[PDB]
């Protein structure tokens, strides 16, 4: 089997991407944030505290003839941005782009933190990291990809995120028309539960490539590119007037600037992030200070190849017995 679904930016900045997902019988379609940095499929629901729902579409398990309470199971997750959610668990039929999994754990939110409430466009998350990170207790549950894998034509999914435009998540096949050149594959460590890999270096604009190992994670659920402070300083030093602002929470730059590109290495291959992809717009409405799309990872503990980086590539998440990542230009 295969599946193919379009993923759409939630706003004009590509702050996140939403993909329609069918849950239950008859189908209830929710727009989920596909997150290769976590491993829970959770949704706003008829159980979510009413004051914490503000415009999201909810899953109502009592209206699904295939929903079953997973008795005794609870979940609770906290994300790197400080947001969180928790609740109980149903199993139900879940379909993405024509690919159907029966008995998928659908984690129903009883509580969500304010940033989820405040984002009316995201109805939940669909985790695509390794199932060892799934938070369901006392019986850990499998991701949608893990459940689908054996049925797929090939044990892979691909992320093809658009810049200020829709893109595609495919399951079970590699669309050879969706990228240019060849796909360069690179080793993955699953030891932390992430799609963790080592970039071979970087360049800023037209500058020379610096060969240096940068361990980080391919994370579709993180908006920006978070790299070591040395690398980030070297980038922003090429932008007149750019500075790190403690009050704003990262590097800012004059909105009048033209940003240089940023290149990252994948083995001997190179992925070029155009400068425009690094512009996240005014820090507040009407400001002439703009927020940068490359930020320091120093306070995180891990480097994160988020959407800013991934949207410059066609990315293969290869879930074979030894997982690997593939990157192609497009």
Swiss-Prot record:
Molecular function GO terms recorded: aspartic-type endopeptidase activity
Catalytic activity: Hydrolysis of proteins with specificity similar to that of pepsin A, prefers hydrophobic residues at P1 and P1', but does not cleave 14-Ala-|-Leu-15 in the B chain of insulin or Z-Glu-Tyr. Clots milk
E.C. designation(s): 3.4.23.22
Cystine residue pairs: 255-290
GO biological process entries: proteolysis
Keyword tags: Aspartyl protease, Disulfide bond, Hydrolase, Protease, Signal, Zymogen
Highest taxon in the source lineage: Eukaryota
UniProt enzyme class: hydrolase
Limits of the Peptidase A1 domain: 17-328
Active site: 35, 199
Entry's family note: Belongs to the peptidase A1 family.
Official protein name in the record: Endothiapepsin
Annotated organism of origin: Cryphonectria parasitica
Name of the gene encoding the protein in the UniProt record: EAPA
